[PDB]
Subunit: 252 residues, 4 copies
């Protein structure tokens, strides 16, 4: 894998979260120039400073802001001369049915989880078309099926999963492949803090019996951006240890 | 009499599948609330149905303030809501590169926000009647199209919102399902060229576009007691469109 | 619904099981001439004798036997002059992973659950084409997704679900619609005998919080055979109270 | 060295995607067992690979007695099995009305029974290595075709067997997944007329048939440590074929 992404420019939104950092490190190890784009400063600055000098840069972005996103994509292309890979990894979650969640909760979910993927993809694509680059969306198993108690989140991830399909049809023939990863439970500080009773309920539904490490999702992002994935287009790859392979029946 | 004295709220009721649903539910005894932003069109449909059993509301379903008011006024005036058909929708053709931010806001406002808001504000009333929701999604929410990116994102949202809300509310006696039509003979597609429409007859195994009555028929079924164990389903009404793996005919 | 299937000939395989009997009664109530086809005699004889005289007949069939199935379909067509509806409702289940289940278990699952649908559909179709009739397959949620501990059964029901699609493409344009119902847990003597701990685990996965009555599955079969389903072709309708609408995550 | 000294059993290894997998796994350090009923073809592939690191088995995978023997002999002789590629397959074109009971038995024997039997008899060995299975399914197992009914039933079985076995064995450290190609340039499709093949370039967004190496690449990925959290997945390698809702292009 040494040199798989040598001198490729990889723009990573939501670069300051577990999967974002793992993606930045994996692509960086394989020779990429990473742009770590996030709202928050501290996390992406710390990651960028850990990576080879001149091969990583941190930016502030609100992915829900189309004017800011267009500017970021054009400045990155101007400064680095190219964009090869977009990882749409920004995310917000809010828990609840539509009865437990507000219009504001909807706007927060929709702005980042839907509008961010639409805007970053639309404004990166002209650059990707020049390099025959690709997009990898961070969707979710929550976009392939429903959850109890995350209605707006499921709507937004459902939008990303089907937008991945539609855009793959629109652009794949012009040499830009568009795919998603659909993770389940990812080991984070939030999941490390869960009681055993909660964590055991999740592990029972996943045949592999554990949460994904963020490196395990990053690995699939790197594969989907690689020449080995040359015939994978419009795919929403479950990275879920078997979660969505079930018909919903309990394990007996 | 399948829907005798059931209150049925139908968005996009002034034309096409909404109008066809209004007539079908009305014929089966429903009191029908016809919601549309096309005022002349929805007034004409309302006036065509039996007196005292149909009322028109001039509303943009993208507007949460207008939607909350409609749902509460309907519930107050008629005493109940039994069925919501989230049918109002608009289409725009093109990739994200050929369609504007404004095109996105129009698609998202009607096709996603409308469904979210109407569902949210009807649900407290549906819980009292053990009522149901039927969303008009599309095959374009079960898979992608060439040249309708924003529309596909919006319909994808409707398909998975259908699933999530069914898990949330099915246990409290409110079933939530969708219909997913392919080509239907309506104002939405009557501008589409013969080249495109003829290819649908190749991609749809039944070899024709659907009549709007044929989707209305499935909406009525999904709201009926015969659908008592169907929940969170996105029912293709597509003559076989989504049954295909995408391959052209092998022979 | 009085007269919806007036004088239509409805051939029901596996007519002696819960869903079969419920289908026979529902179609019979709506005016159909029912042929109740099953291996076993007592159950279908009792149902046929309960239904209007001259409007129900019981037959013995092994649906896994192509020679016997061709003969049954041609004799029914000759005797009644027509076939309008085929309900492929025969089934066997065997529990276990491929490590816990034998070659014989595979042959038993495959013969009835796959070969029966292939053979009955192939030999009924010439008759269905004359009436512009339809097929409704009894598939399962176990054909739309996997189970723990029913590997062969899941393979066979997966075959029925995709054969439903393929045959719908082949025949829908010649006026024979082909669809399936995909039930979850159906209330039977087997499920009535389950301990509360087992039944509670099933009910938790189903948003409606209960097993389907066989009448509730029969209702969907009758709909799929009706003129109201004129544009439904190649569909595998979940009749599962929400079971397959889940992404597999536990309810919290 | 990704597969250094891993034993990889490949059915249908004498041609097409099987042969391409044998060469790819061999280049990455695997010892490759090439199983095929085409004896000259699989012997030529085996003889092309590094001495001591490839062996041919002349076997009909539809035969459970032959398959159990192969799996146990391979395990005894090489001490282990790390990867099974259930790739052997045959195609027949036609509806059930145009294809015979014998056509069915041939399709089912190879395309279903072969996968069931090879999986069943390799699994005890894979459990010892925390190995994996990659099934060659098809888009024709994720949806239907016009004119390949028996093939679609068989591939549908492979797709859902992949899911069920992943739930059964994933917890014991054996991942089970499939690749689902659309049109690939192999002996299976080289007889298909230009009319049909040209329409695939329309239905596949990438606008071409796959090279067999492009599916072999995904087989190697699914057997690799990078796929450590992918289990029960049916991965489309189809240039977009199944991403479509079936509709022809909208513009
Ligand atoms: N016609 C097709 O081929 C097809 C296929 C799949 C799904 N659909 C869906 O069917 C639904 C109905 O559309 P149709 O085909 O019957 O078209 P139509 O144009 O006949 O009817 C749509 C109706 O919705 C109304 N409407 C639009 N936006 C609205 C808003 N913001 N507030 C209130 N009313 C609004 C329109 O005025 C119109 O009366 C839509 O959701 C559409 O996406 C259409
Ligand atoms: N902000 C809003 O309130 C808003 C926004 C958009 C449109 N609308 C309403 O939508 C309605 C339609 O106006 P429009 O500007 O969209 O026109 P339009 O673009 O819909 O033109 C007429 C449409 O209906 C079809 N049509 C034409 N003659 C018809 C007939 N006799 N019967 C049925 N269908 C016919 C046409 O093919 C076309 O689809 C108006 O009532 C308008 O006020 C509301
Ligand atoms: N080529 C395509 O377009 C395509 C698309 C989707 C999936 N597939 C699947 O790919 C797999 C490989 O086929 P291919 O396209 O590389 O074709 P191929 O003809 O190049 O190779 C298939 C190989 O399987 C062998 N084989 C067949 N039946 C066998 C049996 N009973 N026992 C042992 N070996 C047997 C053949 O001799 C041949 O060497 C099959 O499962 C096929 O269904 C093919
Ligand atoms: N019962 C069995 O053991 C059984 C059953 C069927 C076939 N087979 C074996 O399958 C093999 C193929 O024989 P067949 O009768 O299927 O022939 P065939 O029908 O496969 O004819 C040759 C096939 O390979 C292709 N081909 C032709 N020349 C080629 C070349 N130089 N390189 C690569 N591919 C080429 C052709 O396009 C065609 O697909 C034989 O070894 C046969 O014994 C085994
Ligand atoms: N509007 C936004 N613009 C850019 N990045 C954002 C925006 N909203 C959230 N992000 C970033 O996306 C990443 C993923 O968010 P989230 O999933 O909430 O984080 P976590 O995985 O830490 O819970 C975070 O690093 C977050 O700061
Ligand atoms: N080979 C066969 N030919 C015809 N009918 C069969 C065959 N095998 C089983 N059946 C019938 O199919 C029906 C469904 O079988 P099964 O699901 O095992 O029954 P149950 O629902 O009572 O458990 C039964 O009435 C059974 O007798
Ligand atoms: Na995960
Ligand atoms: Na129009
Ligand atoms: Na059920
Ligand atoms: Na050939």
């Amino acid at each position: 894998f040494q040199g798989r992404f040598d001198n490729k420019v990889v723009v990573i939104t939501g670069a300051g979260n577990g999967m974002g950092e793992a993606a930045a490190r994996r692509f960086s190890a394989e020779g990429a120039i990473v742009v770590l784009a996030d709202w928050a400063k501290e996390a992406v600055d710390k990651v960028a400073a850990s990576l080879p000098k001149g091969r990583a840069m941190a930016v502030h972005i609100d992915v829900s802001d189309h004017v800011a996103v267009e500017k970021m994509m054009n400045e990155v292309a101007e400064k680095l001369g190219r964009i090869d890979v977009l990882l749409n990894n920004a995310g917000v979650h809010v828990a609840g049915s539509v009865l437990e969640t507000s219009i504001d909760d909807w706007r927060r979910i929709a702005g980042v989880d839907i509008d961010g993927v639409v805007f970053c993809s639309k404004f990166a694509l002209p650059h990707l078309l020049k390099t025959k680059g690709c997009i990898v969306n961070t969707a979710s198993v929550s976009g392939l099926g429903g959850d109890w108690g995350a209605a707006y989140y499921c709507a937004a991830k459902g939008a990303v999963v089907n937008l991945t399909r539609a855009m793959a049809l629109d652009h794949g023939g012009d040499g830009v492949r568009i795919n998603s990863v659909c993770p389940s439970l990812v080991k984070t500080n939030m999941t490390n803090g869960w009681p055993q009773e909660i964590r055991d309920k999740f592990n029972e539904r996943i045949a592999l019996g554990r949460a994904a490490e963020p490196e395990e999702v990053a690995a699939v992002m790197a594969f989907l951006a690689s020449d080995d994935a040359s015939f994978i287009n419009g795919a929403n790859i479950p990275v879920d240890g078997g979660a969505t392979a079930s018909d919903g029946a309990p394990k007996i």
